[PDB]
Amino acid sequence: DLSQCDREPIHLLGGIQSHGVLLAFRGPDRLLEVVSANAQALLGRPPETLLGQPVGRVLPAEVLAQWEPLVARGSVRVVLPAGAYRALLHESDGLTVLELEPAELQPGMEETALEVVRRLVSPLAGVKGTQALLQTAADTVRALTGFDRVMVYRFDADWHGEVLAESKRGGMDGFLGMHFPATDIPVQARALYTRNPLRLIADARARPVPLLPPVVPALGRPLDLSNSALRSVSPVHLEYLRNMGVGASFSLSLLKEGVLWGLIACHHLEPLHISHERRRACEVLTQLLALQLSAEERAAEASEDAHRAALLGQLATAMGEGGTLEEVLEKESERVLALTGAAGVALLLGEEPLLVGCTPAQDEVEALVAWLATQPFQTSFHTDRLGTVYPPLAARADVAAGILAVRLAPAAARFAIWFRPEVARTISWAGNPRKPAEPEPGHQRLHPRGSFQAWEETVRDTSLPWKRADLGAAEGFRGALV
Amino acid sequence: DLSQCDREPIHLLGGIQSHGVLLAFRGPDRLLEVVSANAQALLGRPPETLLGQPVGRVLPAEVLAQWEPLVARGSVRVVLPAGAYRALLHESDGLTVLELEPAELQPGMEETALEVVRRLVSPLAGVKGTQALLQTAADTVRALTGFDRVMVYRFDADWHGEVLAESKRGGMDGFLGMHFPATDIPVQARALYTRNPLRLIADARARPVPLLPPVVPALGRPLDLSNSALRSVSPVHLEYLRNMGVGASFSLSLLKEGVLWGLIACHHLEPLHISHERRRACEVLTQLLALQLSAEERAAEASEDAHRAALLGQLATAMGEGGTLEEVLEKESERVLALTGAAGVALLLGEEPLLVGCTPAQDEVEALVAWLATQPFQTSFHTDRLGTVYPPLAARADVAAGILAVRLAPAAARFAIWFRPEVARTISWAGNPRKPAEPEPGHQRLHPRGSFQAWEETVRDTSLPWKRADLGAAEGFRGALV
Numbered sequence: 001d002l003s004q005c006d007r008e009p010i011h012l013l014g015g016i017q018s019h020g021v022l023l024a025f026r027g028p029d030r031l032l033e034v035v036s037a038n039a040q041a042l043l044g045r046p047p048e049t050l051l052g053q054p055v056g057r058v059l060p061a062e063v064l065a066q067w068e069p070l071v072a073r074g075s076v077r078v079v080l081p082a083g084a085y086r087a088l089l090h091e092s093d094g095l096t097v098l099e100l101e102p103a104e105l106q107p108g109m110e111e112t113a114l115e116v117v118r119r120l121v122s123p124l125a126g127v128k129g130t131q132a133l134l135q136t137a138a139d140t141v142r143a144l145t146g147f148d149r150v151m152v153y154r155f156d157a158d159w160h161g162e163v164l165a166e167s168k169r170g171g172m173d174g175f176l177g178m179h180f181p182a183t184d185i186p187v188q189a190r191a192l193y194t195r196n197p198l199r200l201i202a203d204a205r206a207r208p209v210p211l212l213p214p215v216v217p218a219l220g221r222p223l224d225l226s227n228s229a230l231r232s233v234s235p236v237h238l239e240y241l242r243n244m245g246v247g248a249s250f251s252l253s254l255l256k257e258g259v260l261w262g263l264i265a266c267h268h269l270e271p272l273h274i275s276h277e278r279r280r281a282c283e284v285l286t287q288l289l290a291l292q293l294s295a296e297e298r299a300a301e302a303s304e305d306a307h308r309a310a311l312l313g314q315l316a317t318a319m320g321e322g323g324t325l326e327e328v329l330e331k332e333s334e335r336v337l338a339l340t341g342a343a344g345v346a347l348l349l350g351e352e353p354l355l356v357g358c359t360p361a362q363d364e365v366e367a368l369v370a371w372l373a374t375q376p377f378q379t380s381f382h383t384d385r386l387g388t389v390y391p392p393l394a395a396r397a398d399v400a401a402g403i404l405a406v407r408l409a410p411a412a413a414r415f416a417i418w419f420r421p422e423v424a425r426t427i428s429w430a431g432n433p434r435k436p437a438e439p440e441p442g443h444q445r446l447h448p449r450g451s452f453q454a455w456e457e458t459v460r461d462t463s464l465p466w467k468r469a470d471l472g473a474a475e476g477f478r479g480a481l482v
Numbered sequence: 483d484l485s486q487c488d489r490e491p492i493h494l495l496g497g498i499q500s501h502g503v504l505l506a507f508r509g510p511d512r513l514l515e516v517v518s519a520n521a522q523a524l525l526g527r528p529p530e531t532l533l534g535q536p537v538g539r540v541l542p543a544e545v546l547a548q549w550e551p552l553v554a555r556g557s558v559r560v561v562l563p564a565g566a567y568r569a570l571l572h573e574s575d576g577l578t579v580l581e582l583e584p585a586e587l588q589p590g591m592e593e594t595a596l597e598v599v600r601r602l603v604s605p606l607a608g609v610k611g612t613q614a615l616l617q618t619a620a621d622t623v624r625a626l627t628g629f630d631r632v633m634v635y636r637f638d639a640d641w642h643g644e645v646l647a648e649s650k651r652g653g654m655d656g657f658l659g660m661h662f663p664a665t666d667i668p669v670q671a672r673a674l675y676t677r678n679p680l681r682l683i684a685d686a687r688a689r690p691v692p693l694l695p696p697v698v699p700a701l702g703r704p705l706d707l708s709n710s711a712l713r714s715v716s717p718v719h720l721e722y723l724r725n726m727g728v729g730a731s732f733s734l735s736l737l738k739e740g741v742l743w744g745l746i747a748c749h750h751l752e753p754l755h756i757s758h759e760r761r762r763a764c765e766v767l768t769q770l771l772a773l774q775l776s777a778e779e780r781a782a783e784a785s786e787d788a789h790r791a792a793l794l795g796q797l798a799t800a801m802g803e804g805g806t807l808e809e810v811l812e813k814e815s816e817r818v819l820a821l822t823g824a825a826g827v828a829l830l831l832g833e834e835p836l837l838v839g840c841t842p843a844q845d846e847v848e849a850l851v852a853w854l855a856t857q858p859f860q861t862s863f864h865t866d867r868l869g870t871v872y873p874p875l876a877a878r879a880d881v882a883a884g885i886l887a888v889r890l891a892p893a894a895a896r897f898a899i900w901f902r903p904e905v906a907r908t909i910s911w912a913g914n915p916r917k918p919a920e921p922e923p924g925h926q927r928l929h930p931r932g933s934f935q936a937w938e939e940t941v942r943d944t945s946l947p948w949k950r951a952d953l954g955a956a957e958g959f960r961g962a963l964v
């Protein structure tokens with residue numbers, strides 16, 4: 001339901017955060033086209049007067065002095081009478097956007113940055129699980145930033161999330177282990193955070209600073225702030241932070257292999273600015289964790305295939321030890337079941353269902369089986385909530401919540417089918433998930449939920465999901481039973 | 483071990499490098515037990531007059547002031563009359579070793595390392611090969627250190643090596659593509675360089691500074707300088723470097739999944755000293771490269787298994803369909819050879835052999851078959867130098883330099899054998915690999931070779947090696963064939 005939450009144009013809200021100043025210039029003269037309403041505090045003149053002027057008549061010589069590395073390298077530290085500032089240049093809507101926010105003052109920031117970086121490479125990580133991997137990343141972002149709480153947030157396949165790891169001050173409330181609606185981060189935001197992987201909300205109570213004029217005159221809409229570091233966020237989201245007790249918020253996108261794996265979310269009870277130089281040091285940590293997780297995941301899946309393939313080879317040696325169909329399956333029952341991590345297996349080598357292990361009754365097999373041939377799957381069909389797909393068996397989640405069947409013949413319907421029983425899982429949603437928002441009457445005004453306390457839910461009638469190794473093992477068993 | 487090369491106790495040579503000072507204290511009084519002979523250059527008093535004195539009376543006040551963080555963190559910057567120094571503590575032979583070394587002078591050093599760390603962690607690495615991954619490792623290590631030439635050196639299975647990548651300042655000889663004998667880095671060095679990942683030789687012309695006494699009086703041998711940043715290196719190597727025309731040398735160990743994969747080797751035409759803190763920055767880069775290589779490599783091998791398994795998946799459909807064995811083993815011939823990257827396959831499934839593709843003649847295969855049935859292998863056997871283990875086919879490197887064989891039956895001689903042809907290769911050694919050293923008459927003193935000029939060698943009668951995927955595919959195919 002592409003609803004109110006997904007429709008807000010969070011890049012065209014036309015305001016910025018108060019700790020910074022934004023200028024935008026057009027054309028060969030670099031004439032001031034747009035300017036934030038608070039620019040007097042740095043430029044010494046009312047912003048209204050500066051509109052339309054050449055850039056040499058607007059910026060101080062300090063900033064203009066560093067224009068070329070600004071343009072080349074994208075950012076420079078300038079020292080102005082007001083103090084040390086970071087200047088950030090990008091292009092948006094055919095304008096040259098210039099943003100100025102307070103520079104990093106801690107001289108040894110990069111030295112400490114390099115030290116935590118060492119902690120996230122080390123010899124080997126994940127040494128007691130990729131769990132210890134996330135906990136290090138959480139602890140190092142928190143060491144580097146000073147945020148009262150830091151959490152590693154992963155997306156599920158339906159874009160809801162759970163906090164997997166957490167590093168926070170003593171006496172802080174936590175969120176470790178809970179799940180959050182997919183609508184807490186709607187579709188257009190995930191889209192943006194796939195492009196722009198950083199965001200600081202320095203003070204969740206502050207007023208947003210408007211831009212002048214409110215529309216880019218040639219465009220008829222406000223300036224696109226997709227890449228702005230000062231961009232003020234959805235007012236819906238500010239209300240969510242305050243409903244949470246949060247005063248400052250800083251988050252970074254974990255992009256694993258081009259996709260949006262999750263987030264590193266940081267909370268501070270009080271307003272808190274983090275310099276751009278230091279936000280970029282944190283970005284290095286998140287790219288490093290994304291690298292550590294790919295290499296451990298790929299190593300785990302290799303070890304998985306190695307175990308399955310040893311099983312397959314032990315099955316081959318068995319069959320190659322005497323003309324003996326239904327009996328070697330009987331004699332190698334665990335290996336046929338562990339092939340795909342199953343609890344039973346129906347083998348339709350044609351005649352009668354040969355039922356091994358923990359299986360439904362014979363009739364129920366054939367009925368499941370008749371129904372299977374009429375499906376548009378090539379060599380294999382798999383599911384974890386069978387009963388959703390076939391309620392003739394919805395009451396047998398004791399033995400067949402999930403199934404994995406490979407077609408043993410092209411035409412005709414010989415099958416091997418592995419069965420899995422349900423595993424009940426309790427999950428703690430952070431708030432009642434049936435009511436994730438609060439609409440006013442008329443439904444044109446949405447609000448975040450008011451509560452986040454654990455709202456608990458047990459899931460039934462779904463099995464453990466069929467992993468990639470289970471599928472590959474199934475393909476191989478089919479390879480040797482033809 | 484073989485050569486006298488392997489016998490040199492390079493950790494007990496008894497000297498340090500002249501740009502630093504080493505001091506070793508024993509026992510609760512921190513009495514001075516061992517000190518380098520140049521220690522007056524930083525302490526005022528004659529070193530021998532200091533042996534047997536408490537630490538409090540021998541060290542300058544500047545060093546003593548920093549004593550507690552030095553004991554805690556194990557490294558510390560102190561400002562001495564002779565300049566800024568880095569102080570390091572380690573333990574060796576029941577003594578507390580203190581080494582002094584000139585410190586880093588560029589205050590923006592770590593900001594520079596943090597930027598190049600971004601270059602190397604950057605997602606979408608290797609998107610023009612692991613080869614472009616290595617080139618970036620050389621280029622950034624060269625950027626961070628300023629050496630005239632930085633090379634990337636990979637060890638082969640016999641521990642000879644080749645330079646896979648190279649970054650060097652313009653107008654300088656290179657070594658890209660060349661190979662170097664295993665004896666160039668002898669066995670005790672490879673062992674030491676596994677557990678000690680850095681070495682700096684700052685001045686290849688300099689004489690070492692001796693320790694006093696020449697032995698630890700308790701032990702009757704020199705102080706173990708294994709973990710010493712100032713250790714003076716084997717004179718045979720110092721001669722090697724001078725023969726190479728190198729004035730300073732610095733190298734780092736590439737450790738990948740715990741074993742010594744190779745080195746990043748740095749040469750300077752002139753003496754040059756890298757700070758400890760800058761050396762530790764380069765170490766960050768190498769653990770990065772190691773990590774980038776593991777994820778890329780396990781990515782490649784998983785992509786490979788995927789193609790093999792798709793071949794296997796399509797073989798299984800060809801079976802379980804029309805006809806006999808040899809029938810389908812004739813349309814799918816291209817897949818059967820492809821399974822293992824091979825130009826031929828012989829199939830012994832009962833009658834005469836089934837020869838598919840480019841194979842040696844039926845009598846030769848029958849002769850090879852009977853010899854295979856008497857060898858200590860369980861299901862698979864493979865080689866890439868068939869002729870040097872089976873001379874009957876040494877002449878047939880045109881069709882059978884490599885074989886890969888699987889048993890399709892236990893106590894029986896049922897086999898699938900894949901053949902490969904020779905693939906000739908032109909190695910360029912850095913000098914004559916038959917004379918990799920110039921020994922003196924009576925063979926008591928060795929010297930490195932005099933020349934490193936390109937020296938060609940062609941390797942015949944060897945096939946392309948059998949990779950994990952090849953082996954994996956073969957076993958899976960045996961799975962299919964009862």
Ligand SMILES: C=CC1=C(C)/C(=C/c2[nH]c(/C=C3N=C(/C=C4\NC(=O)C(C)=C4C=C)C(C)=C\3CCC(=O)O)c(CCC(=O)O)c2C)NC1=O
Nearest residue numbers: 005010180183184189233234237249251265437446447448
């Ligand atoms: C650990 C748990 C946790 C979650 C799940 C979380 C959600 C979350 N919501 C966000 C933004 C957002 N949330 C919303 C909208 C909504 N949000 C709602 O709950 C409903 C009511 C709507 C809409 C009807 C929008 C539009 C943004 C984008 C803010 C912006 O970039 O403008 C962000 C990015 C901004 C930031 O880092 O603070 C996060 C991390 N924050 C956390 O700490």
Ligand SMILES: C=CC1=C(C)/C(=C/c2[nH]c(/C=C3N=C(/C=C4\NC(=O)C(C)=C4C=C)C(C)=C\3CCC(=O)O)c(CCC(=O)O)c2C)NC1=O
Nearest residue numbers: 487492662666671715716718719731732733747919929930
């Ligand atoms: C371009 C490729 C390339 C190679 C292959 C190379 C070899 C090499 N030899 C080394 C050490 C060494 N080499 C030797 C010994 C020998 N060496 C000989 O050729 C024979 C004569 C002996 C002995 C019989 C020893 C003993 C060491 C250990 C040095 C030490 O740490 O004390 C080292 C480590 C120290 C350093 O980085 O300088 C390298 C890199 N250097 C390069 O740049």
